Amino acid sequence: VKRGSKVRILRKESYWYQDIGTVATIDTSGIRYPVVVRFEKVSYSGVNTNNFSLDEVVEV
Amino acid sequence: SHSVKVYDTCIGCTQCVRACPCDVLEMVSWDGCKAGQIASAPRTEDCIGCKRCETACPTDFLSVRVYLGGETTRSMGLAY
Amino acid sequence: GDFLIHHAIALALHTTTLILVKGALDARGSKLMPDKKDFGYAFPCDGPGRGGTCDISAWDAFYLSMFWMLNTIGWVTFYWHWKHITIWQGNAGQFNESSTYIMGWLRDYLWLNSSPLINGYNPFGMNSLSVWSWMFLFGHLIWATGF
Amino acid sequence: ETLNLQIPSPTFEGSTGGWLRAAEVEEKYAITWTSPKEQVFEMPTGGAAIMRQGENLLYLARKEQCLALATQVKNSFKITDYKVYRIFPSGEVQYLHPKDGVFPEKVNAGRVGVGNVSHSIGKNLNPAQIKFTSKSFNG
Amino acid sequence: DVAGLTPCGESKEFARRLDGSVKKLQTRLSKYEAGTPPALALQKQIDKTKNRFDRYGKAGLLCGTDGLPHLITDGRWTHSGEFVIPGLLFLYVAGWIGWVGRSYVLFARTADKPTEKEIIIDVPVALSFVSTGFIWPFSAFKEFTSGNLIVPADEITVSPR
Amino acid sequence: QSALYTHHQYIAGFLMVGAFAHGAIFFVRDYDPEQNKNNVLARILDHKEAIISHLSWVSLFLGFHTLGIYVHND
Amino acid sequence: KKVSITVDRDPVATSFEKWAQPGHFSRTLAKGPKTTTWIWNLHADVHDFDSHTNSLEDISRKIFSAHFGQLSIIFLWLSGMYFHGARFSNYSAWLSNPTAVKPSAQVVWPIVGQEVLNGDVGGGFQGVQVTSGFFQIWRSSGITSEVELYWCALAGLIMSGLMIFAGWFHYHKAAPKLEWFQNAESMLNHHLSGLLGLGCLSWAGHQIHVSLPVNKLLDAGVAPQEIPLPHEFLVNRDLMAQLYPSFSKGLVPFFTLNWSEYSDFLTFKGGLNPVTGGLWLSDTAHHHLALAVLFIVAGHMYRTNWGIGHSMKEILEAHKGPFTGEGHKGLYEILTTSWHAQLAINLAMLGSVSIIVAHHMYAMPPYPYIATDYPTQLSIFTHHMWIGGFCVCGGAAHAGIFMVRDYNPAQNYNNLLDRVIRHRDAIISHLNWICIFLGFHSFGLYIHNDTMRALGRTQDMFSDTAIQLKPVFAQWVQSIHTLAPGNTTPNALATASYAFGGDVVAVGNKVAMMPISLGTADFMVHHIHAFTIHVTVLILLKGVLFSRNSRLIPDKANLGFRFPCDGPGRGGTCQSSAWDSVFLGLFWMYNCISVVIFHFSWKMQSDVWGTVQSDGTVTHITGGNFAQSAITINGWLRDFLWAQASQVIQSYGSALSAYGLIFLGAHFIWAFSLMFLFSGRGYWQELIESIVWAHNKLNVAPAIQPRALSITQGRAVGLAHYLLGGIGTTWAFFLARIISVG
């Protein structure tokens, strides 16, 4: 993906699994979960952002 | 004792380690997150099972997971 | 009166089914505990985080449906017994008129039929219904201690 | 390193909240810290005590009681000089916290990671797969 | 008649219901003087009670052995005014409320602060929506067939299982 | 006649709860989703929110109006 | 003059802007909702001022103006009580026949058949019978006409407008500074002397010049419109000297200290007026005059601006002995810097006074014709027992909020608080033992009796007939009070109350008061009371003493006053907060006050209330069944709950059908509460998920994401509906029962 794009989450235990977020940053370093995605819904913990990997994220 | 696990989704925020009332958790060096550090559970015999670490954790599903197990004098928090 | 109680019994069958089906289908996971299957069938909670997780286990839906099972068999057996005791007297019209509102169930079934039971002993003597009169109070005591 | 048993104790008038027979037959915990002042603090087990200027020493029944005091002593009196010990009735004194001289929330070399699972939490094994098998659910 | 019931206009038990209801009011009226406010209040209640019993008798309702009206709800047209037409009236209002509430929640999603529109309602826009509800059956079905009522299963968050 | 009816309906309600409880114990403990790919069992779990919300509607539907008529009558 | 008035002028701007911004008062809530929890958190924390602001000055200002708002509501409430008496009541008909007409000041509209509630209360009137005792107050006041009730209604409305103006004015225009609120000596001097002292003195003046002449003419038998207006007693001193000849001498006997001249209207009679069954109003006038003097005297104790007076700090710091360390040192600083510590004391005392009011008003009936109005006697006893029990539990609620928040160990070293917290295990273990002993030896006596009566062994029961547990100490105290007139209260003519012994006072052939004998059943239920009060103290004291820390949670003060738990570890710490002991102690308060009002209701019907006829014998409402049937639980179930629930169940189709509906409705609310009490939040959030899914399917999900209620709010909602349901059931049962038979 690229920064600022809209993505549909594919991590089955995510709060936002099959919901749309927007990509904040992507880390070039060897990070296991380099895609930073922000959402408009908060999770049950009140967090509105999470890190993801490329194989857990699809552009819409 | 209780079983406390740290999954590789840990962003190294150290919040679980600061919230732990029994010094169960500490930070060890890593290279899988930007912070360069991951939570660790070297002293789970002292874990009382409060799950204050899980409350502190900000990853979408908890990087730190407490699994309540056999009860002891330490994990039952008995001063008697 | 029979129409109304059957729809109450239908309400209680679908609501008991709801708690139990929700317990069976959310047993493996939910959105609060997506890894609920790692913890077993009967665990207390996942702690106060994520808003609070009291009664989140699949066992706890057994626990909650047990109250609804007791409520439904109450509605079934209250109906069976009142419909039969009024017929056995020869006064089926007492059920026919009083079952359509809830005060008819309270006064013409529970309050009216209580009197031989609660007079099994009194300051004037006792009879052989004294044991059921004692089990009656005994049952109210165990029930309240559960609270 | 070892607990100097002779360190004076904070002026306290006693309480019923202190340790019971399990401390003298199973284990006891101690906390030491340096105070720049002769000031009142709150005991985890009850009322208020006064820590003496210099080195203080307490005995508590639970490890959490020593750390709850350590949290308070560092948040209101900015004492970061606290060392927590475990004491067995055999006389053995076991240093506890901070375990390697550095606080746990700060990284340190030579710390080996315990409990770390290489996958995310959703990648565990289903219970049916490991039934009548010793294999662990973490992959 | 239907299910062994009797039309309320010829039920003798319905007739005794009306009489007992009026005797109960007349004995309360026997304790007041003619022009008093308690006498006028009870005389108006005897008029209301008689009117209700007269209307029920002439309406085609069926009475039981207990002398009370019974409702037939199996779908027959001679009895559609007891459930089917009140039900048709209900569903029109209920779908109206549902269509109007749904239209406002979709509007509020496109707002500057979507959750402020739900605790502080934009009353001119929310009144624009309430007026639209009169043709909800046509508006909602066209919404359905145009692929805008139902979202596909793969844009809905579900539990891992 | 009264005791026998009451006895066996209470036995029935306990047995019915236990079946659903042990169905819950089955899914947690004994159900393997990979030996059940696209079964009737797996497809149940695939639309569990459809099942649970429609029980929720029918319970509320029955409850609002059954209690509502009774309160109206009272 | 260090006691001075200091005010900030125009502090806060009168703007509608913050009205449009719900949640403006806290930093968390002011950024808007994202889940439905925000909506509940908005109402939960709104009057928690010391949770929004750091400064004690702004907190004190919000409290002072909110107390004016409360006063405005009470005055509006009082004004409406007078207006309904003036406009929609049978008051004037009741004045002619107090023993025949039933008070009624509420008339319903005819809408859905609900006009059946306008029952025949008497006096050519239809309405809802009222039991608040206003009619008896108004006759005691000397109102005698609806015209004067309209003027009282306007007087309440003018006061209601003035209080809401003052609350606005003192928050927005002229707000006092913290040094104004921190004048405890000045406030006590004025509230003893000015509020309570001039309150009693002025009311004594109304009683002497208006209540005494008007009520003497009424009890002589003069018709209400035949009675001179209250100012003609003020001017025509000859007319006042007809009724009370001491007025011929005026105020010379007062000033020259020849007070015995005033014995016409300042009596010490005791007992009841035979005509009305109420207290002699000449006694109440002397009571209020004497109370007024020593409230004005008491309000000169403390030092303000001239060197005379006590320093309250000096009094407290001097009271210290060898057991109690530094003593009461530091308590002045607590009570002039913590509003919660002040509210904890004042709620516990106000609750205690409300419980005392319930006992004193049934036993020494103060108003004319209130003793034989049994619906009022039962209503105001039951109402003031509940107000007392609720206010007592809020005293421990705010003692906990003080300890968690306003308590500072540095300023409380070795004083009485420090010492209480440092032996709280000894307090809670000894109270715990007393409650086990009390429960076994009060309720177990009932269980012994249930079993023996069921087993056919009536000789083995604790009864007046069998083994006797007599209350000799209560019987002895009753003996002393009957002997007191002429002996240890020599100038009294009658006893303080006929409940202690003496005559039967009958008004309109109904018993006003008569000796309330104490037997084994009275011994048993009094120890039932001591058990339920001690357990309530146990739950609430344990919450206050362990609010900051336990052996379980060493840092409970960091979690706050109100937290649901500290996790499932340590075996489980569910309901470990100080809030959760108030939650558990309101159930045991409910249990306690329910037995008190049941004891009162059954005893008064069985042994006191009823009808007198020839041979002077009294036929009581339930015929004296208390002695031999209140000793078993089956007796309370059968002869009290079952026997007396007949009126509320058979009430349909009458004017009491409203009580029949509220009986069922409250049974519903009570049961519905158990959904919230026995369940947990985790079930309800997962159920909401499937409901959210069906909304997502139809694209109608809300932007304020629905949540299950918090763990605490589930406890608060469960307790509130339990109390609403439990108390509402008894309210209908009490009111339909006593209106029908009493």
Ligand code: CLA
């Ligand atoms: C404070 C206590 C109190 C109480 C409990 C009552 C209770 C009652 N009064 Mg009494 N009354 C009172 C004070 C009180 N009154 C006072 C002080 C006066 C003198 C002005 C009166 C004068 C009075 C008269 C003259 C009458 C009553 C009547 C009634 C009855 C029906 C009222 C009704 O449905 O009107 C409802 C009227 C409406 C206009 C409905 C308004 C509903 C709105 C929506 C409430 C909303 C409040 C609002 C949202 C608050 C927020 C403000 C906003 C800016 C957000 C009821 C028994 C009637 C009666 O007994 O008839 C036999 C009657 O005729 N009252």
Ligand code: CLA
């Ligand atoms: C003689 C002096 C005096 C009197 C009567 C009062 C009376 C009162 N004060 Mg106090 N107060 C005083 C001096 C006085 N104060 C001083 C000197 C201070 C500064 C240290 C305070 C500081 C203070 C605080 C901080 C608070 C009060 C509160 C209250 C009210 C308590 C609630 C209550 O019972 O009201 C109901 C009883 C009544 C009798 C209602 C009466 C209403 C008016 C104001 C009473 C006086 C009217 C007037 C003097 C009488 C004229 C008589 C004329 C017809 C001949 C009450 C009105 C509390 C309150 O509720 O705030 C509003 C509160 O929070 N006062």
Ligand code: CLA
């Ligand atoms: C108008 C808005 C709206 C719409 C279209 C729906 C639509 C639906 N809801 Mg409901 N719901 C709503 C509001 C709404 N909901 C609110 C406010 C709540 C909180 C009480 C709920 C609570 C709720 C539950 C608990 C359940 C549903 C269910 C359902 C489904 C079946 C219909 C039903 O059972 O109704 C039931 C409706 C209620 C129980 C409450 C409705 C209360 C009012 C009447 C609606 C709100 C009016 C709103 C203020 C509109 C203002 C518009 C204005 C600003 C222009 C359907 C998806 C059920 C489901 O999932 O089954 C498949 C189900 O179990 N909903």
Ligand code: CLA
């Ligand atoms: C009398 C007691 C009572 C009542 C009424 C309920 C009612 C309900 N329960 Mg609960 N429950 C109870 C006891 C009770 N329960 C107990 C003791 C337990 C054991 C802990 C449970 C455990 C339990 C579980 C575990 C579940 C339920 C469910 C349900 C629902 C099933 C019936 C239904 O779906 O529609 C009936 C609907 C109603 C009865 C609502 C009444 C309509 C209200 C009163 C409208 C009135 C509005 C009025 C103006 C409000 C005035 C407020 C005032 C301040 C102005 C319903 C909300 C299930 C559920 O939520 O599924 C959807 C569910 O999963 N209950």
Ligand code: CLA
């Ligand atoms: C929610 C609160 C609440 C409500 C709705 C009521 C409602 C009622 N009360 Mg109760 N009351 C309450 C709380 C409440 N009370 C508390 C907390 C107390 C303890 C102080 C009392 C003490 C009380 C008494 C002593 C009397 C009532 C009476 C009444 C009734 C007539 C109302 C009236 O005009 O008062 C009229 C009140 C009077 C005419 C006399 C009041 C005399 C007291 C001593 C004045 C004290 C004022 C002072 C500022 C308070 C100081 C408190 C102290 C701790 C320092 C009505 C049923 C009267 C009643 O039952 O009549 C049938 C009655 O005589 N109340």
Ligand code: CLA
């Ligand atoms: C003079 C009396 C007084 C005062 C000033 C206060 C003031 C306060 N209390 Mg205390 N309290 C009191 C009496 C008092 N309380 C009593 C008598 C009790 C015993 C029940 C308590 C128990 C108590 C607890 C347990 C707590 C407080 C808290 C608070 C604070 C927050 C208030 C708030 O935001 O609530 C907002 C108000 C509401 C949400 C109102 C809803 C409450 C009920 C459910 C509605 C009322 C039902 C109604 C009467 C009947 C309905 C009729 C029905 C048929 C429809 C505030 C400092 C809280 C706190 O954190 O303080 C720091 C807290 O946790 N209080």
Ligand code: CLA
């Ligand atoms: C009927 C219901 C019931 C009963 C019996 C109890 C019983 C008790 N509660 Mg509980 N409680 C209840 C409902 C009940 N509660 C509810 C609904 C709540 C909800 C809020 C609570 C909340 C609560 C709290 C928060 C507290 C209690 C406390 C207590 C104890 C009071 C001390 C006492 O009386 O010891 C005596 C014991 C009894 C009276 C129990 C009955 C025993 C009788 C005499 C017969 C004994 C028969 C004998 C043992 C037979 C032996 C042979 C047999 C084994 C074969 C006691 C264990 C308090 C406590 O534990 O402190 C001491 C306390 O702090 N309760």
Ligand SMILES: CC1=CCCC(C)(C)[C@H]1/C=C/C(C)=C/C=C/C(C)=C/C=C/C=C(C)/C=C/C=C(C)/C=C/C1=C(C)CCCC1(C)C
């Ligand atoms: C939770 C759970 C998880 C997974 C595993 C699990 C254990 C399987 C599960 C549990 C599931 C559970 C507990 C499931 C419980 C399932 C139950 C109780 C099913 C009831 C079935 C009854 C039927 C089909 C009656 C049919 C009658 C008919 C057709 C009569 C017809 C007629 C005749 C012949 C005569 C009259 C005329 C008519 C009316 C025409």
Ligand code: SF4
């Ligand atoms: S209150 Fe609920 S979340 Fe907290 S420990 Fe108890 S069960 Fe778990």
